[model samples]
Target: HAPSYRVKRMDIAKNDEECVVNAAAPRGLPGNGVCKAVYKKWPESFKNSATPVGTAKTVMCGTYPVIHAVGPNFSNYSESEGDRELAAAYREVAKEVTRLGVNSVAIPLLSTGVYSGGKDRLTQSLNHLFTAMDSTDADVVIYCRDKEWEKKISEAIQMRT
Candidate 1:
């Protein structure tokens, strides 16, 4: 396990400078949700790419660095597969963030949005990710856009503590 970390909430879209924005792999397009928003903001980087699940790819969305951590691809949305992919992706994020010496990273609860695993599943996934990030040097900031989700993450962390 790593040293104790802090939890914070913010809108990742607004702050891009010196921050790594966490995105879903096999990134979505047009009007698809988180991936869509990412794609729209960085069409040149995300378009024509289908990175494999559980792998992470970093691209520049203008000046902001975006880390696309593959959780669930469109074809394989099964819970079991998603869980494995999510774990791998989280570990990758931790490694990449440290490797890049990033000061802050904005991320969502993996597999919660667009991927559609539901809150219970999302909470479980968050726990797995938090454990993975426990040893990393970079400060992980989770972008909780929904009130319920924010509560869930706080509760999960509190329970862990």
Candidate 2:
């Protein structure tokens, strides 16, 4: 799992990817006192939301930003509407980004893996999210857990690109 800490310095980033990719272990959100934003130039949102808001993590942007996608429905999500809920959640996150003036975000799969979300729902959610936000300058990225997941995300993103 990626440790809880601020990993700024994108130039020092080992990979050029927009988000961190991990599945074997997950990195906890940037907790207070440990994970803080580090950037050559911090965005206004990062500056304004500097202090940790309770459980909320530090603000991040650009390639090294961390955006963990989650829906209100976790274990209780209905099969029929789960994907739509997840897509709405992403859209909300995008709205939050816009409100905060943070245009780019790095995200994880909503309610998948240990959260037990079905693949079909996950796929549909991503499909809707990527498609719905095609015109925005806000960048959304799913931190792939492996090559297969990477391929899946690539295909989804390619459709938008």
Candidate 3:
């Protein structure tokens, strides 16, 4: 399941990608990306409640809906469990794009922040995201946290493909 494919790398923007994936919270709240521009439309109860783990919450963010994939908090789980949940998050994103007929999509470095393994468990998290994103037929553009990190992702993909 760790197959690899050639995927494009780019800075996040509203370009040819028909859809985009946001690294979000299970509570249906936008972390700090595209959703920061527009408030997401989640069920009212989700405010008090929360979407379960490994769920992808899509929001109608004007032109194209953004797929807000929820990755598990590594701090609360074992390494294997974190990998499984992160893979599921990306898997859900792929399924959502299929359902929406999205020909191209962009994804961030999923769940590498507060929920991240940082320098320790960060390695597996990155590969899981890259491999899963490659599973979708969509023309995928992987955006980065910084230009330096963009180079880092490029290197990671190089080793995979």
Candidate 4:
């Protein structure tokens, strides 16, 4: 089964960046917004490794200092262990969001894309999303990376509800 925090589908006016950000703006600050700080968890391989690798990164978009502190965790596993790393990544982001006093949050299907973490692992990693936090009245919409994940998360959240 899946977790209760992920969003399978959202009724958006448009699927562009602006549309998605706008949809989430009313509820809380967009983590990637130009005004506020954004922190994304970086894969370990991108860090502690050797010279520059692919397009992998540990910093936020552009050169913003407020959005400093790259989550230097996740990755380094050979097989599908997305659940552990994904949960760790989620917890890292949650810490940032709480520190920023965010009342709500919107997240995409993590690791399902390039990380290739399977559904079971993903769900396990996310189970604490709704219950772990204490402050900052939290709400999340799980935006899927693709239509297939959309259906998958949608069904999963539905059962939890």
Candidate 5:
């Protein structure tokens, strides 16, 4: 498994290689949440054409720059998309992080935001993300507000050990 850690803070991110932002394919500005804030905070990054799914583009802004992962189109996601795509997308980010020689990366719970998947899908996606980054040297930090996720991931780590 990857050297994954969980952090509960909302503003703990301290460079482009250290933080990740959930983004969509069309790269349109988001209307809500941290995504919206990031978009507003870095309008220049979203000006480009649509980034393909399961991929990512880095943005430099503020104290912690971001790796924007290309997710589903906003409000167009369907169940058929499944969790695999989100997992693959995160895997792509992991690859980028490794290539950049980053010491760590912070990723959100995939398939649960703009992707619009179930909680089970979130768990499955996390497993895939962890697996994909398992070989990377960078520490994978999961940033979240949910205690359940932390508990679940901790249990999963223990199980793997």
Candidate 6:
């Protein structure tokens, strides 16, 4: 089951989330996206660093520097193993947030895109995200490009009684 916490939802704007999360890539986010504003040097730094799955590199474009985490490649695990790996990815993201002493963070649809994880990816992701965010003492923001997910995630967090 998904662990509930102070998870909020919103369509991300430049500073909506104190820390933004993305996949582990040299450069990402197309036009009108976060990466378009991230500093040039950090992507190189993000690439140079070692970011294994369930782990991340905290780049500082400063409030906007952003986090690039290596979420699991769902294509590589057995069912249970995949679930374990997926949860840890969220765990690690929260863990890193503490390490940096940040109070808030933002993440995207980390499960489907790059996730390639089988069916029920959204539910799986929502539960895992809640579980991990529950571990932190800060605000967790689930950001969406299209506004649908913000509301979707909210029902999972706010209406689940």
Q: lDDT: which candidate is best?
A: 1
List runs of model 5 lying over 4 Å from the truth.
1-4, 7-17, 21-26, 40-50, 62-64, 73-80, 117-120
Candidates 4 and 5 compared: the better one by lDDT is 5
Model 3 TM-score (2 dp): 0.74
Q: Write the per-residue lDDT of candidate 4 for residues 1-161, one digit (tens) a residue.
A: 22225464543222222111111111122324311212122222122222111111222222211212221113445443434444444455556555555445455433432334333334543453433332234565555435665776667667766
6-84 in candidate 2: lDDT tens per residue?
1122322233334421111123323221122322222321433332111123345543443333443345666656655
Query: What does candidate 1's lDDT look like per residue over 68-152, in tens digits?
Result: 7777642456767777877888888787777777776776666666665443556667886887777676656666677777777
For model 4, give the 10-residue run with minimal summed lDDT. 18-27
Give candidate 6's TM-score: 0.71
For residues 18-61, what per-residue lDDT tens digits would candidate 3 score against the true structure?
Answer: 77776666676655553342233322322332356787866654
Candidate 6, residues 1-161, lDDT tens digits: the string is 33233444443434455677664533333312333334343454343445666666676653454676656667776667777767877787888777777667777645554455555476788788777777777666675554465567667777656
The per-residue C-alpha lDDT of model 1 at residue 37 equals 60
Q: Which stretches of candidate 3 lie over 4 Å from their true place?
A: 1-16, 33-50, 120-122, 159-161
Residue pairs with clashing backbones, model 3: none
- Reference-based lDDT, each prediction: 0.65, 0.41, 0.63, 0.36, 0.60, 0.60
What is the TM-score of candidate 2?
0.52
Model 1: worst 10 consecutive residues (lDDT sum): 1-10
Question: C-alpha displacement of 66 in model 1, angstroms?
Answer: 0.6
Q: Could you tell me which 10 consecutive residues in candidate 3 have the lowest summed lDDT?
A: 37-46
Could you tell which candidate, 3 or 4, scores higher by lDDT? 3
Q: What TM-score does each of the candidates earn? A: 0.77, 0.52, 0.74, 0.47, 0.73, 0.71
The local distance difference test score of model 5 is 0.60
| Model 3: lDDT of residue 156 | 73
Q: C-alpha displacement of 65 in model 6, angstroms?
A: 4.3
Q: Write the per-residue lDDT of candidate 5 for residues 53-143, one digit (tens) a residue.
A: 7677765555444667765532465545645566677777777677666777777655555455333455666687777778688776665
Model 5 residue 104 CA deviation (Å) reads 0.8
